[PDB]
Design a binder for this molecule. Structure first.
Ligand code: HEC
Length: 104
């Protein structure tokens, strides 16, 4: 899975909002380094809402997908703003990069 297709997309979708690299400090949203293999609200440096912090679920390729399709519903009353994604492929590459972005 091409990460690029997920990088650019992650930009036009997640630009100067999220973070992956260590240098990417918490800004608008929480950083994603240990995404794969880490539950939600696992940021002791940035406490989230009571809706997301309650979203006790792992961020996998099976979940990320759904959420990517409709994260709003996935977490109502959240702070994250998004419309969603139609193409399932654009989401794959997105998770194909975020994985290599977080893992790193
Ligand atoms: C800033 C305006 C954001 C944009 C753009 C995106 N995200 Fe985000 N995200 C943001 C916040 C403040 C939070 C916390 C809860 C909330 O929804 O407000 C999140 C959370 C996530 C999570 C959950 C991680 C956790 O620790 O629970 C994921 C998996 C996530 N966001 C992914 C993500 C992607 C891939 C985006 C673009 C496609 C994206 N976010 C946009 C704030 C913002």
């Amino acid at each position: 899975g091409d990460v690029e297709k997920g990088k650019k997309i992650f930009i036009m979708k997640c630009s100067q909002c999220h973070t992956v690299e260590k240098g990417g400090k918490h800004k608008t949203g929480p950083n994603l380094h240990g995404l794969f293999g880490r539950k939600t609200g696992q940021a002791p440096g940035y406490s989230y809402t009571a809706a997301n912090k309650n979203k006790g679920i792992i961020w996998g390729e099976d979940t990320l997908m759904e959420y990517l399709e409709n994260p709003k519903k996935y977490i109502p009353g959240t702070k994250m703003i998004f419309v969603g994604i139609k193409k399932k492929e654009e989401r794959a590459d997105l998770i194909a990069y975020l994985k290599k972005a977080t893992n790193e």
